[PDB]
Amino acid sequence: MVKLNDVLSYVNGLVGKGVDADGWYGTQCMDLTVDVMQRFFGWRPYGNAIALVDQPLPAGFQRIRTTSSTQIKAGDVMIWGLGYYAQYGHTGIATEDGRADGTFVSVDQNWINPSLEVGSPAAAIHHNMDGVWGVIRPPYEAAMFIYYKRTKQGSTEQWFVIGGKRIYLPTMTYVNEANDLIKRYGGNTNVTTYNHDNFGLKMMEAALPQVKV
Amino acid sequence: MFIYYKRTKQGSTEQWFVIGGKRIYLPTMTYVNEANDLIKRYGGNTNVTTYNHDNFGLKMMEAALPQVKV
Amino acid sequence: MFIYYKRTKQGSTEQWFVIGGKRIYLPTMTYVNEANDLIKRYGGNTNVTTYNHDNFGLKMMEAALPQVKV
Amino acid sequence: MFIYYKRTKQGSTEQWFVIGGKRIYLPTMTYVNEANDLIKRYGGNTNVTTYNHDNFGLKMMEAALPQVKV
Ligand SMILES: [Ca+2]
């Protein structure tokens, strides 16, 4: 399973460069988080940064509202969602545990010299807790697949592909059991969200009949 | 390809064989042996898990993988 | 899951996607991009081979893998 | 994706190709060679085993994998 040092090496290596994960508006803040999460965990977070507050998370991930910097651990995905940040959010990756004086260090894009059009390169930033909502804590070492669908009406459904079929997962216990199947039988642990009008999703939905549980 | 065990409502333990997107109940140890040889030949999964009849993982496999009779 | 190309009777080269024991014709760039992304996500096979429309390997694939639209 | 041989009740040997959850009788060597080429391209299993017609492993495959023609 994923080693924290691998993530931190990679993240610290990006400092001074930028990654564009989506092909819009150059190197925005979410681009970094999405790049790292996709390469290391096979998870593509959905939406703007602020959508990290409440979108579903893959197996093993935890989300914590943080009152204090001392709750921040190295390799946490930081979420800003309060105040100015309530509209779009901000994100970046914690490269160190949070400090006792109310500060922390994260590598973020589009923080220094921000740009709506082209974003800005990754930088290592000594932050305070102003606007911080919390963290997503990925499952690091020592401390058949599912996909998500964003519906026309603005909900996120989880779906399970198995035996050439697709199953809508109605509850989190269904989710947990499908993840257990994945684990046992060597399914794929990738998690991506598709908008209801995405052609990838349309092909999947046409090829894999729905069955009910 | 894999085998699993099902605890039925009536408390018997059944062996089932998943192959080709289908489920086959294995009625005798000769069938079970032949299923395991198939697993070995064709790179199937050797995990054996026991599922209670009300387990939602079981329910999702039964819904998605039609039964065929040998 | 994989993509293959088919050189048709009328001389065009078509992209086709195999997923779920089915095949999907990928008529435009937009389809092709999305299919390639599925391959990367879900550990599809990245062999790309071109088949002439009368190739028997192709014929077997077409008999075994029904076509589904959109 | 794999090939197996079947020795029939009347004593001839048939080559069969498993693909897409289906099975295809391979009527000539050209079909055989193209099936082998599919296996190599798409990381199919290269096990080649002969089954007598009465074998229970073969009967399970034959029940789970419908035949398609070519
Ligand atoms: Ca971008």
Numbering used by the authors:
A (entry chain C): 1 to 25, 27, 27A, 28 to 119, 121, 121A, 122 to 143, 168 to 237
B (entry chain A), C (entry chain D), D (entry chain B): 168 to 237
From the paper:
Endolysins are hydrolytic enzymes that specifically recognize the host cell-wall and cleave the peptidoglycan to digest the bacterial cell-wall for release of phage progeny during the lytic cycle, which is why they hold promise for the treatment of multidrug-resistant bacterial infections as an alternative to antibiotics. LysIME-EF1, an endolysin isolated from E. faecalis phage possesses a highly efficient lytic activity to multidrug resistance E. faecalis. PSI-BLAST search predicted that LysIME-EF1 consists of an N-terminal catalytic CHAP (cysteine, histidine-dependent amidohydrolases/peptidases) domain and a C-terminal CBD (cell-wall binding domain). Our finding provides structural and functional evidence that LysIME-EF1 belongs to a unique two-component multimeric endolysin encoded by a single gene.
Fortunately, we obtained diffractive crystals of selenium-labeled protein in different crystallization conditions, which were then optimized and diffracted well in the space group P1211 with cell parameters a = 47.03 Å, b = 56.92 Å, c = 91.52 Å, α = γ = 90.00°, β = 96.29°. Finally, the structure was solved successfully using the data sets belonging to the space group P1211 by selenium single-wavelength anomalous dispersion (Se-SAD) method. The crystal structure of WT LysIME-EF1 refined to 1.75 Å resolution revealed that WT LysIME-EF1 possesses a CHAP domain (residues 1–143) and a CBD (residues 168–237), which are connected by a linker (residues 144–167). The electron densities for the CHAP and the CBD domains are unambiguously defined, whereas the electron density for the linker is missing due to its high flexibility. In addition to the full-length LysIME-EF1, three additional CBD fragments were successfully built into the final model. The four CBDs together form a tetrameric ring 45 Å in length and 45 Å in width. One side of LysIME-EF1 tetrameric CBDs, which we speculate to be responsible for recognition of peptidoglycan, is arranged in a planar surface, while the other side is more convex in shape. The N-terminal CHAP domain of LysIME-EF1 folds into a typical globular domain containing two α-helices, two 310-helices and six β-strands. Analogously to LysGH15, LysIME-EF1 CHAP domain also contains a calcium-binding site and a classical amidohydrolase catalytic triad (C29, H90 and N110). Electron density of the calcium ion is clearly identified in the crystal structure, and the calcium ion is coordinated by the conserved residues D20, D22, W24, G26, D31 and one water molecule.
